[PDB]
Amino acid sequence: PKKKIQLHAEHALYDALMILNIVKTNSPPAEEKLEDYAFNFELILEEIARLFESGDQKDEAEKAKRMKEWMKRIKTTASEDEQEEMANAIITILQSWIFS
């Protein structure tokens, strides 16, 4: 399922990057879209976790579950600094899945 995971990770990275751009900007309309990007991201990461679970990469599946919880923090409670830190952590992991 590596090819499937790579494709899901690319689309999840698109969501995460748009969210990071929203976090770093003060745009009244762009704050409404953050929840939509976040929910889409959570759906993708749940599927990535299952694909890892279907294989023998339990640690990677646990990473995917945590990233889903981080995005829940990003879209609800988190401060701008906390949002960016979690967004960057997410982006780093997705890049590792995409390029290796």
PDB file of C-alpha atoms in Angstrom:
ATOM      1  CA  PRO A   1       0.000   0.000   0.000  1.00  0.00           C
ATOM      2  CA  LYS A   2       3.025   2.295  -0.279  1.00  0.00           C
ATOM      3  CA  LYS A   3       1.744   3.919  -3.481  1.00  0.00           C
ATOM      4  CA  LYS A   4      -1.672   4.481  -1.884  1.00  0.00           C
ATOM      5  CA  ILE A   5      -0.083   5.918   1.274  1.00  0.00           C
ATOM      6  CA  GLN A   6       2.163   8.213  -0.768  1.00  0.00           C
ATOM      7  CA  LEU A   7      -0.827   9.614  -2.675  1.00  0.00           C
ATOM      8  CA  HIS A   8      -2.862  10.126   0.507  1.00  0.00           C
ATOM      9  CA  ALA A   9       0.130  11.827   2.121  1.00  0.00           C
ATOM     10  CA  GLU A  10       0.476  14.219  -0.834  1.00  0.00           C
ATOM     11  CA  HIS A  11      -3.154  15.278  -0.480  1.00  0.00           C
ATOM     12  CA  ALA A  12      -2.818  15.531   3.303  1.00  0.00           C
ATOM     13  CA  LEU A  13       0.247  17.734   2.792  1.00  0.00           C
ATOM     14  CA  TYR A  14      -1.784  20.061   0.569  1.00  0.00           C
ATOM     15  CA  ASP A  15      -4.326  20.484   3.375  1.00  0.00           C
ATOM     16  CA  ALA A  16      -1.611  21.019   5.995  1.00  0.00           C
ATOM     17  CA  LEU A  17       0.192  23.632   3.884  1.00  0.00           C
ATOM     18  CA  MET A  18      -3.011  25.581   3.236  1.00  0.00           C
ATOM     19  CA  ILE A  19      -3.735  25.460   6.971  1.00  0.00           C
ATOM     20  CA  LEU A  20      -0.236  26.729   7.755  1.00  0.00           C
ATOM     21  CA  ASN A  21      -0.818  29.610   5.327  1.00  0.00           C
ATOM     22  CA  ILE A  22      -4.127  30.421   7.037  1.00  0.00           C
ATOM     23  CA  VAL A  23      -2.439  30.330  10.460  1.00  0.00           C
ATOM     24  CA  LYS A  24       0.280  32.766   9.367  1.00  0.00           C
ATOM     25  CA  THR A  25      -2.234  35.212   7.833  1.00  0.00           C
ATOM     26  CA  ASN A  26      -4.963  37.463   9.238  1.00  0.00           C
ATOM     27  CA  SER A  27      -7.628  37.024   6.547  1.00  0.00           C
ATOM     28  CA  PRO A  28     -11.277  37.087   7.718  1.00  0.00           C
ATOM     29  CA  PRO A  29     -12.552  34.809   4.920  1.00  0.00           C
ATOM     30  CA  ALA A  30      -9.595  32.426   5.099  1.00  0.00           C
ATOM     31  CA  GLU A  31     -10.275  31.545   8.737  1.00  0.00           C
ATOM     32  CA  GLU A  32     -13.600  29.917   7.837  1.00  0.00           C
ATOM     33  CA  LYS A  33     -11.863  27.508   5.436  1.00  0.00           C
ATOM     34  CA  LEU A  34      -9.436  26.220   8.073  1.00  0.00           C
ATOM     35  CA  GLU A  35     -12.082  23.927   9.560  1.00  0.00           C
ATOM     36  CA  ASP A  36     -12.784  22.483   6.102  1.00  0.00           C
ATOM     37  CA  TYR A  37      -9.106  21.800   5.373  1.00  0.00           C
ATOM     38  CA  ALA A  38      -8.700  20.316   8.860  1.00  0.00           C
ATOM     39  CA  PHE A  39     -11.646  17.925   8.570  1.00  0.00           C
ATOM     40  CA  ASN A  40     -10.458  16.793   5.134  1.00  0.00           C
ATOM     41  CA  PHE A  41      -6.989  16.234   6.618  1.00  0.00           C
ATOM     42  CA  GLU A  42      -8.394  14.132   9.478  1.00  0.00           C
ATOM     43  CA  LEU A  43     -10.277  11.911   7.018  1.00  0.00           C
ATOM     44  CA  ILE A  44      -7.102  11.301   5.011  1.00  0.00           C
ATOM     45  CA  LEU A  45      -4.937  10.572   8.056  1.00  0.00           C
ATOM     46  CA  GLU A  46      -7.481   8.050   9.337  1.00  0.00           C
ATOM     47  CA  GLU A  47      -7.156   6.215   6.018  1.00  0.00           C
ATOM     48  CA  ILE A  48      -3.354   6.420   6.157  1.00  0.00           C
ATOM     49  CA  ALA A  49      -3.434   4.905   9.654  1.00  0.00           C
ATOM     50  CA  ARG A  50      -5.526   1.969   8.422  1.00  0.00           C
ATOM     51  CA  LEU A  51      -3.173   1.366   5.494  1.00  0.00           C
ATOM     52  CA  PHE A  52      -0.241   1.311   7.916  1.00  0.00           C
ATOM     53  CA  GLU A  53      -2.216  -1.017  10.216  1.00  0.00           C
ATOM     54  CA  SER A  54      -2.949  -3.322   7.276  1.00  0.00           C
ATOM     55  CA  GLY A  55       0.835  -3.608   6.925  1.00  0.00           C
ATOM     56  CA  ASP A  56       3.461  -4.245   9.592  1.00  0.00           C
ATOM     57  CA  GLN A  57       4.237  -0.589  10.435  1.00  0.00           C
ATOM     58  CA  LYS A  58       2.580  -0.127  13.821  1.00  0.00           C
ATOM     59  CA  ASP A  59       4.733   2.883  14.751  1.00  0.00           C
ATOM     60  CA  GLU A  60       3.772   4.707  11.545  1.00  0.00           C
ATOM     61  CA  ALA A  61       0.080   4.042  12.223  1.00  0.00           C
ATOM     62  CA  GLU A  62       0.511   5.473  15.731  1.00  0.00           C
ATOM     63  CA  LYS A  63       2.126   8.554  14.172  1.00  0.00           C
ATOM     64  CA  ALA A  64      -0.867   8.974  11.854  1.00  0.00           C
ATOM     65  CA  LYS A  65      -3.313   8.730  14.773  1.00  0.00           C
ATOM     66  CA  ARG A  66      -1.405  11.381  16.729  1.00  0.00           C
ATOM     67  CA  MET A  67      -1.334  13.695  13.695  1.00  0.00           C
ATOM     68  CA  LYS A  68      -5.121  13.422  13.460  1.00  0.00           C
ATOM     69  CA  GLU A  69      -5.347  14.514  17.102  1.00  0.00           C
ATOM     70  CA  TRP A  70      -2.924  17.387  16.484  1.00  0.00           C
ATOM     71  CA  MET A  71      -5.151  18.674  13.682  1.00  0.00           C
ATOM     72  CA  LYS A  72      -8.119  18.586  16.061  1.00  0.00           C
ATOM     73  CA  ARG A  73      -6.086  20.834  18.361  1.00  0.00           C
ATOM     74  CA  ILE A  74      -5.171  23.114  15.439  1.00  0.00           C
ATOM     75  CA  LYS A  75      -8.774  23.706  14.365  1.00  0.00           C
ATOM     76  CA  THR A  76     -10.236  24.278  17.843  1.00  0.00           C
ATOM     77  CA  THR A  77      -8.286  25.312  20.921  1.00  0.00           C
ATOM     78  CA  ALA A  78      -4.777  26.120  19.777  1.00  0.00           C
ATOM     79  CA  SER A  79      -3.060  29.508  19.739  1.00  0.00           C
ATOM     80  CA  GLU A  80      -1.362  30.757  16.579  1.00  0.00           C
ATOM     81  CA  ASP A  81       2.079  29.736  17.860  1.00  0.00           C
ATOM     82  CA  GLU A  82       0.835  26.289  18.890  1.00  0.00           C
ATOM     83  CA  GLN A  83      -0.947  25.864  15.536  1.00  0.00           C
ATOM     84  CA  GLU A  84       2.243  26.583  13.591  1.00  0.00           C
ATOM     85  CA  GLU A  85       4.381  24.240  15.683  1.00  0.00           C
ATOM     86  CA  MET A  86       1.952  21.343  15.244  1.00  0.00           C
ATOM     87  CA  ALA A  87       1.473  22.166  11.560  1.00  0.00           C
ATOM     88  CA  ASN A  88       5.232  22.037  10.953  1.00  0.00           C
ATOM     89  CA  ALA A  89       5.524  18.728  12.823  1.00  0.00           C
ATOM     90  CA  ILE A  90       2.755  17.314  10.632  1.00  0.00           C
ATOM     91  CA  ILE A  91       4.417  18.614   7.457  1.00  0.00           C
ATOM     92  CA  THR A  92       7.743  16.989   8.370  1.00  0.00           C
ATOM     93  CA  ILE A  93       6.193  13.541   8.877  1.00  0.00           C
ATOM     94  CA  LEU A  94       4.128  13.714   5.677  1.00  0.00           C
ATOM     95  CA  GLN A  95       7.265  14.598   3.708  1.00  0.00           C
ATOM     96  CA  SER A  96       8.966  11.500   5.148  1.00  0.00           C
ATOM     97  CA  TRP A  97       6.062   9.325   3.978  1.00  0.00           C
ATOM     98  CA  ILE A  98       5.935  10.976   0.536  1.00  0.00           C
ATOM     99  CA  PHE A  99       9.649  10.841  -0.311  1.00  0.00           C
ATOM    100  CA  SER A 100      10.547   7.500   1.309  1.00  0.00           C
TER     101      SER A 100
END
